[PDB]
A paper describes a structure:
Human [name] (huUHRF1; ubiquitin-like containing [name] and RING finger domains 1), also called ICBP90, is a multi-domain nuclear protein associated with cellular proliferation and epigenetic regulation. huUHRF1 contains a plant homeodomain or [name] finger (huUHRF1-[name]) that was shown to be necessary in the opening of dense chromocenter structures, possibly through its chromatin-binding ability. We proved that huUHRF1-[name] is a histone H3 reader that shows preference for unmethylated versus trimethylated H3K4. In this work we show that the [name] finger of human [name] represents a new mode of histone H3 recognition that requires the appendage of an additional zinc finger, relies mainly on the recognition of H3R2, and shows preference for unmethylated H3K4, although it can accommodate H3K4me3 without compromising the complex formation.
Two forms of the protein were produced, huUHRF1-PHD314–367, which contains the canonical [name] finger sequence, and huUHRF1-PHD296–367, a larger version that includes the additional putative zinc finger. Indeed, we were unable to determine the structure of the complex between H3 peptide and huUHRF1-PHD314–367, the shorter form of the protein that lacks the additional zinc finger. Crystals of huUHRF1-PHD314–367 obtained in different crystallization conditions and grown in the presence of a large molar excess of H3 peptides belong to space group P6522 and diffracted X-rays up to 1.43 Å resolution. However, the crystal structures invariably showed one protein molecule in the asymmetric unit with no peptide bound. The structure of huUHRF1-PHD314–367 in the free state is very similar to the structure of huUHRF1-PHD296–367 in complex with the histone H3 peptide except for a significant shift of residues 353–358 in loop L2, which anchor the N-terminal amino group of H3A1 in the huUHRF1-PHD296–367 -H3 structure, and a major conformational change of the N-terminal region (residues 314–316). In the absence of the additional zinc finger, the N-terminal tail (residues 311–316) of huUHRF1-PHD314–367 blocks the binding of the histone peptide in two different ways. First, the Cα of C316 is displaced by 3.3 Å towards the histone H3 binding site and its side chain is flipped towards the position of the H3K4 side chain in the huUHRF1-PHD296–367-H3 structure. This conformation of C316 suggests that when this residue is not engaged in the additional zinc finger, it could interfere with histone binding. Second, due to crystal packing, the N-terminus of a symmetrically related molecule occupies the histone binding site. All together, the flexibility of the C316 residue and the crystal packing artifact could explain the difficulty to obtain crystals of huUHRF1-PHD314–367 with the histone H3 peptide bound.
Residue numbers in the entry: 311 to 365
Write the structure that this text describes.
Amino acid sequence: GHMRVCACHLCGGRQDPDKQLMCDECDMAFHIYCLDPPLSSVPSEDEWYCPECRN
Ligand SMILES: [Zn+2]
Ligand SMILES: [Zn+2]
């Protein structure tokens, strides 16, 4: 298989993969700290929808 780049949609960085969430609709990655407002911790739950897709 191939590796996806998964850069943060907001900042363009790949740092702190442990602090990134992937949107289960649009498949884009986000740092929790790049969201406006930021999420404080990576939720233990494996489902997540970005601000665009949740609405
Ligand atoms: Zn970011
Ligand atoms: Zn999304």
